[PDB]
Design a protein around this motif. Sequence first.
Motif, PDB file in Angstrom:
ATOM      1  N   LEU A  65       0.833  -1.179   0.000  1.00  0.00           N
ATOM      2  CA  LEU A  65       0.000   0.000   0.000  1.00  0.00           C
ATOM      3  C   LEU A  65       0.879   1.244   0.000  1.00  0.00           C
ATOM      4  CD1 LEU A  65      -2.663  -0.928   2.544  1.00  0.00           C
ATOM      5  CD2 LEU A  65      -2.785  -1.227   0.088  1.00  0.00           C
ATOM      6  N   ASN A  66       0.283   2.356  -0.361  1.00  0.00           N
ATOM      7  CA  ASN A  66       0.968   3.642  -0.239  1.00  0.00           C
ATOM      8  C   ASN A  66      -0.027   4.718   0.148  1.00  0.00           C
ATOM      9  OD1 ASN A  66      -0.304   4.704  -2.604  1.00  0.00           O
ATOM     10  ND2 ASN A  66       1.557   4.513  -3.881  1.00  0.00           N
ATOM     11  N   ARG A  67       0.470   5.949   0.276  1.00  0.00           N
ATOM     12  CA  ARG A  67      -0.361   7.010   0.831  1.00  0.00           C
ATOM     13  C   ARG A  67      -1.180   7.734  -0.217  1.00  0.00           C
ATOM     14  NH1 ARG A  67       1.278  12.415   0.278  1.00  0.00           N
ATOM     15  NH2 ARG A  67       3.344  12.735  -0.699  1.00  0.00           N
ATOM     16  N   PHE A  68      -1.134   7.278  -1.469  1.00  0.00           N
ATOM     17  CA  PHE A  68      -1.742   8.042  -2.549  1.00  0.00           C
ATOM     18  C   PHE A  68      -3.131   7.523  -2.889  1.00  0.00           C
ATOM     19  CE2 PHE A  68       2.769   8.796  -4.274  1.00  0.00           C
ATOM     20  CZ  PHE A  68       2.888  10.037  -3.639  1.00  0.00           C
ATOM     21  N   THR A  69      -3.841   8.342  -3.652  1.00  0.00           N
ATOM     22  CA  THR A  69      -5.031   7.915  -4.359  1.00  0.00           C
ATOM     23  C   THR A  69      -4.852   8.197  -5.868  1.00  0.00           C
ATOM     24  OG1 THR A  69      -7.452   7.956  -4.288  1.00  0.00           O
ATOM     25  CG2 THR A  69      -6.296  10.094  -4.152  1.00  0.00           C
ATOM     26  N   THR A  70      -5.927   7.982  -6.622  1.00  0.00           N
ATOM     27  CA  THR A  70      -5.888   8.225  -8.065  1.00  0.00           C
ATOM     28  C   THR A  70      -7.312   8.502  -8.549  1.00  0.00           C
ATOM     29  OG1 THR A  70      -5.153   7.308 -10.225  1.00  0.00           O
ATOM     30  CG2 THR A  70      -6.043   5.726  -8.579  1.00  0.00           C
ATOM     31  N   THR A  71      -7.426   9.283  -9.619  1.00  0.00           N
ATOM     32  CA  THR A  71      -8.706   9.228 -10.314  1.00  0.00           C
ATOM     33  C   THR A  71      -8.775   7.928 -11.115  1.00  0.00           C
ATOM     34  OG1 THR A  71      -7.913  10.302 -12.357  1.00  0.00           O
ATOM     35  CG2 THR A  71      -8.687  11.781 -10.538  1.00  0.00           C
ATOM     36  N   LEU A  72     -10.011   7.514 -11.423  1.00  0.00           N
ATOM     37  CA  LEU A  72     -10.193   6.344 -12.277  1.00  0.00           C
ATOM     38  C   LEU A  72      -9.540   6.545 -13.644  1.00  0.00           C
ATOM     39  CD1 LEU A  72     -11.421   3.500 -12.507  1.00  0.00           C
ATOM     40  CD2 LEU A  72     -13.503   4.660 -13.217  1.00  0.00           C
ATOM     41  N   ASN A  73      -9.769   7.712 -14.290  1.00  0.00           N
ATOM     42  CA  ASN A  73      -9.074   8.091 -15.531  1.00  0.00           C
ATOM     43  C   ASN A  73      -7.570   7.881 -15.476  1.00  0.00           C
ATOM     44  OD1 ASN A  73      -8.864   9.477 -18.234  1.00  0.00           O
ATOM     45  ND2 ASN A  73      -7.795  11.140 -16.996  1.00  0.00           N
ATOM     46  N   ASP A  74      -6.907   8.502 -14.489  1.00  0.00           N
ATOM     47  CA  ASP A  74      -5.455   8.437 -14.441  1.00  0.00           C
ATOM     48  C   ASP A  74      -4.995   6.992 -14.197  1.00  0.00           C
ATOM     49  OD1 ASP A  74      -5.016  11.116 -14.971  1.00  0.00           O
ATOM     50  OD2 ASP A  74      -4.740  11.653 -12.846  1.00  0.00           O
ATOM     51  N   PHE A  75      -5.726   6.256 -13.356  1.00  0.00           N
ATOM     52  CA  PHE A  75      -5.397   4.847 -13.189  1.00  0.00           C
ATOM     53  C   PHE A  75      -5.429   4.121 -14.514  1.00  0.00           C
ATOM     54  CE2 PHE A  75      -6.630   0.476 -12.929  1.00  0.00           C
ATOM     55  CZ  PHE A  75      -5.627  -0.029 -12.156  1.00  0.00           C
ATOM     56  N   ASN A  76      -6.501   4.275 -15.268  1.00  0.00           N
ATOM     57  CA  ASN A  76      -6.567   3.547 -16.526  1.00  0.00           C
ATOM     58  C   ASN A  76      -5.497   4.001 -17.517  1.00  0.00           C
ATOM     59  OD1 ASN A  76      -8.592   1.721 -16.009  1.00  0.00           O
ATOM     60  ND2 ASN A  76     -10.176   3.258 -16.245  1.00  0.00           N
ATOM     61  N   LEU A  77      -5.181   5.289 -17.541  1.00  0.00           N
ATOM     62  CA  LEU A  77      -4.123   5.737 -18.427  1.00  0.00           C
ATOM     63  C   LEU A  77      -2.785   5.077 -18.103  1.00  0.00           C
ATOM     64  CD1 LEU A  77      -4.917   9.468 -18.744  1.00  0.00           C
ATOM     65  CD2 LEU A  77      -4.970   7.866 -20.637  1.00  0.00           C
ATOM     66  N   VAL A  78      -2.485   4.844 -16.811  1.00  0.00           N
ATOM     67  CA  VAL A  78      -1.235   4.185 -16.472  1.00  0.00           C
ATOM     68  C   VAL A  78      -1.339   2.692 -16.725  1.00  0.00           C
ATOM     69  CG1 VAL A  78       0.356   3.606 -14.544  1.00  0.00           C
ATOM     70  CG2 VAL A  78      -0.634   5.974 -14.798  1.00  0.00           C
ATOM     71  N   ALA A  79      -2.415   2.081 -16.214  1.00  0.00           N
ATOM     72  CA  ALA A  79      -2.489   0.624 -16.281  1.00  0.00           C
ATOM     73  C   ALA A  79      -2.514   0.116 -17.724  1.00  0.00           C
ATOM     74  CB  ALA A  79      -3.717   0.134 -15.521  1.00  0.00           C
ATOM     75  N   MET A  80      -3.164   0.831 -18.648  1.00  0.00           N
ATOM     76  CA  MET A  80      -3.092   0.335 -20.035  1.00  0.00           C
ATOM     77  C   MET A  80      -1.707   0.367 -20.651  1.00  0.00           C
ATOM     78  SD  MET A  80      -6.858   1.866 -21.065  1.00  0.00           S
ATOM     79  CE  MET A  80      -6.858   1.072 -22.674  1.00  0.00           C
ATOM     80  N   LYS A  81      -0.757   1.082 -20.065  1.00  0.00           N
ATOM     81  CA  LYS A  81       0.609   1.012 -20.554  1.00  0.00           C
ATOM     82  C   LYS A  81       1.290  -0.280 -20.142  1.00  0.00           C
ATOM     83  CE  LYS A  81       0.674   6.042 -20.564  1.00  0.00           C
ATOM     84  NZ  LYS A  81       1.317   7.353 -20.112  1.00  0.00           N
ATOM     85  N   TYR A  82       0.656  -1.052 -19.276  1.00  0.00           N
ATOM     86  CA  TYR A  82       1.170  -2.362 -18.920  1.00  0.00           C
ATOM     87  C   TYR A  82       0.285  -3.488 -19.452  1.00  0.00           C
ATOM     88  CZ  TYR A  82       3.836   0.326 -15.352  1.00  0.00           C
ATOM     89  OH  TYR A  82       4.700   1.161 -14.668  1.00  0.00           O
ATOM     90  N   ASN A  83      -0.566  -3.194 -20.449  1.00  0.00           N
ATOM     91  CA  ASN A  83      -1.500  -4.139 -21.054  1.00  0.00           C
ATOM     92  C   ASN A  83      -2.523  -4.663 -20.045  1.00  0.00           C
ATOM     93  OD1 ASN A  83      -0.692  -3.902 -23.612  1.00  0.00           O
ATOM     94  ND2 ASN A  83       0.054  -6.003 -23.865  1.00  0.00           N
ATOM     95  N   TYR A  84      -2.970  -3.780 -19.133  1.00  0.00           N
ATOM     96  CA  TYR A  84      -4.068  -4.082 -18.246  1.00  0.00           C
ATOM     97  C   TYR A  84      -5.364  -3.650 -18.913  1.00  0.00           C
ATOM     98  CZ  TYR A  84      -1.692  -5.646 -13.975  1.00  0.00           C
ATOM     99  OH  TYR A  84      -0.988  -6.412 -13.100  1.00  0.00           O
ATOM    100  N   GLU A  85      -6.424  -4.403 -18.653  1.00  0.00           N
ATOM    101  CA  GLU A  85      -7.776  -4.050 -19.078  1.00  0.00           C
ATOM    102  C   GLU A  85      -8.230  -2.766 -18.395  1.00  0.00           C
ATOM    103  OE1 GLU A  85     -10.522  -5.373 -21.129  1.00  0.00           O
ATOM    104  OE2 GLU A  85      -8.587  -5.842 -22.035  1.00  0.00           O
TER     105      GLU A  85
END
Lengths: 305, 305, 9, 10
Positions: free
Chosen positions: A220-240
């Motif tokens: 875990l870490n101390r951060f959060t994310t918007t759903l948008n920003d999460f998806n923008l990062v995760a798709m760079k690792y071939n995540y759905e």
Amino acid sequence: SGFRKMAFPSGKVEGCMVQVTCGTTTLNGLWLDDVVYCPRHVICTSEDMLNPNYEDLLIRKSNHNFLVQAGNVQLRVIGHSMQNCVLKLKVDTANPKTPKYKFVRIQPGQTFSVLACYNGSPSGVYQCAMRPNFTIKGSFLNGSAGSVGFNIDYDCVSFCYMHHMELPTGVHAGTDLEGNFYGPFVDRQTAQAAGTDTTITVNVLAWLYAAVINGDRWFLNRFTTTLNDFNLVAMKYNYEPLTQDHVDILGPLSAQTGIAVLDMCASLKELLQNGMNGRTILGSALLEDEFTPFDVVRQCSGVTF
Amino acid sequence: SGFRKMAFPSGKVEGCMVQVTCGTTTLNGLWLDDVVYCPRHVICTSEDMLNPNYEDLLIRKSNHNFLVQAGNVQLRVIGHSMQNCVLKLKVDTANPKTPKYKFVRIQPGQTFSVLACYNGSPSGVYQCAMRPNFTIKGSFLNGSAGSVGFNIDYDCVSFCYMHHMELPTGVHAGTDLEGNFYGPFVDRQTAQAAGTDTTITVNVLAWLYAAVINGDRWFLNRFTTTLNDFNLVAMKYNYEPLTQDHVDILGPLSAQTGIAVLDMCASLKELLQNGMNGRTILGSALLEDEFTPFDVVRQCSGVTF
Amino acid sequence: GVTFQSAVK
Amino acid sequence: GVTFQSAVKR
């Protein structure tokens, strides 16, 4: 405590497995009440594999061209029809071991147990998921077609997969129990290939929640994310992409652990960035994606550690 | 193609599971012939567990103190005795679903399938190894005691494990079906811990052979080694010593794949010294040790039961 | 801790 | 290529 790839007990399905033979071709069938379900490619010959016309192949068969064997007993076939890519052989005995059951078509990301069978007999049971590219990563050899995938929540067997064929990369394709293929595949041996596959993000989040329930928080870490920003990062690792539906589905695990879904998404973002730095999570050195949120609640304690 | 953590079909064992209740304590039992086997701690209250005298506690119980439920049928208990850490409840009906079976005590490194049960009802199945430190990394919650582990061979269920307890690290301990503990554990509420574990070398080698059979070859190399050289590395990395018996057991796989055992040992030695350099084997970033040589043959050749 | 994994009836 | 996983009858 602990966390395993946990299948359903296979007995209720074992009691339905038979052998179906047409010509010199054999595979498994599923005997429920007085119907035996099996892949229609049992009526192919070695001449019929690239462009079979199954209507034409089937009209040439009589009932007694199907040899159906249930253990030491030959079942008598009294009718036959095809529904999409499955044959349905009507037999003159209802299976006395038929469980309570239903047919369900599942969505990518859903998991199920597979009872791998040869010659109508069981070899073993394992857990699988429907991949985003509509293949399954099974363990299947020649003669396994007609093996089925299922869940048994609440004492009713939900049959969701019947095995047909293996693709060039060694993954598997098949149908629901109404004979409709998962994905764009067809029961022809013509060249076909799995699309690019992706990681099932909502299931990785489920499994991180399982790790917290069982006692571990190091990732875990101390951060959060918007759903948008999460998806923008995760798709760079071939995540759905993660949808709001997925976020909603994770609500119960988020509530049990006190970790907001988008805070777990922040943890996942950092795990993809860092790796595990020699650690493991629930016994694995990779992020696991074949456990669903429902699977985690099925298996884990309702009390987090 | 494919390679999965595969359990034995569990149907033969499902028909043997019952619920056993004594007082306010419930767990599972194994109903074979006219005897129900279960952990002897079912007769204990929490206070009893701190310093139990099982013979003394059992003397106070009558047959009607044991409520045994097979599905919706109450079994009539007509005798009760204990063997080591299990109770044997004699009932007035032989289980008509008793399979061909034997009780077998396994050795560390051997694998088996667990049928996890609650309230006498089978809930899940997964594959386990007996660790070198005699624990099992199970997945068990309260109510799972009396769940069993087993192997099958052709017709015969070999029961090898009955679940009793969870240790502080979340791993599990239990007995054979004659009530003898695996590992230096006792059925008393007192401080107990798993000892340091090691990795099951012969199983890792078996899984490397499974990987080669599945086309994963990147870890093969031109080198070979000797048993003595290899075992110095095994000691350094907390791997079990490899014996001549282990080399002999791998013989099938080594002549089949085209890769001699001590050639495969030189691959494992290089993997221990250098890691996997970002690569994976059979979908794992860890060296898997819960497949025996026979597990690999049974899955890769489609052995049935 | 150490847990004997019966359940309360 | 693509392989139907029937088998030849024994």
